[PDB]
């Protein structure tokens, strides 16, 4: 089996990989567009960073599942058992 | 003139040109709003 072994560290690369570029993509654009209203009315600030979280939980939903479908196959590795 | 009242016109002298929570949605640049404003200001004075 010593094909198998080592090329799951290409999924494990990939999965942490394609979802650490998007999350920090996802946030700079989330993030500046809540700068700019905060910059133009600072009394709402309170009120868009609640509004902020909720779109950060549905924004990582993913990456998380990911995340940790890549430490699964890392320390309990399921491919390795099907020979 | 002035009116102070129907039987007296008071003579005046009036200054034209020389004159906080939330923020306005300026289609045009705030510039060529305000220049333009303020032109219609002194209209408006020198008309009443």
Avoid: C
Avoid at chain 2, 42 to 47: A, T
Wanted: hydrophobic share 50%.
């Amino acid at each position: 089996m010593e094909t198998v072994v080592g090329l799951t560290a290409i999924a494990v690369a990939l999965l942490i990989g394609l979802g650490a570029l998007g999350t920090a993509i996802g946030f700079g654009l989330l993030g500046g567009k809540f700068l700019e209203g905060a910059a133009r009315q600072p009394e709402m600030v309170p009120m868009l960073q609640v509004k902020m979280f909720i779109v950060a939980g549905l924004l990582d939903a993913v990456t998380m599942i990911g995340v940790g479908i890549a430490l699964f196959f890392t320390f309990a590795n399921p491919f390795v058992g099907q020979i | 003139n002035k009116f102070v009242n129907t039987m007296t016109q008071k003579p005046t002298v009036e200054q034209l040109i020389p004159l906080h929570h939330w923020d306005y949605l300026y289609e045009p640049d705030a510039k060529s709003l305000l220049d333009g404003l303020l032109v219609r200001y002194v209209e408006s004075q020198v008309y009443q």
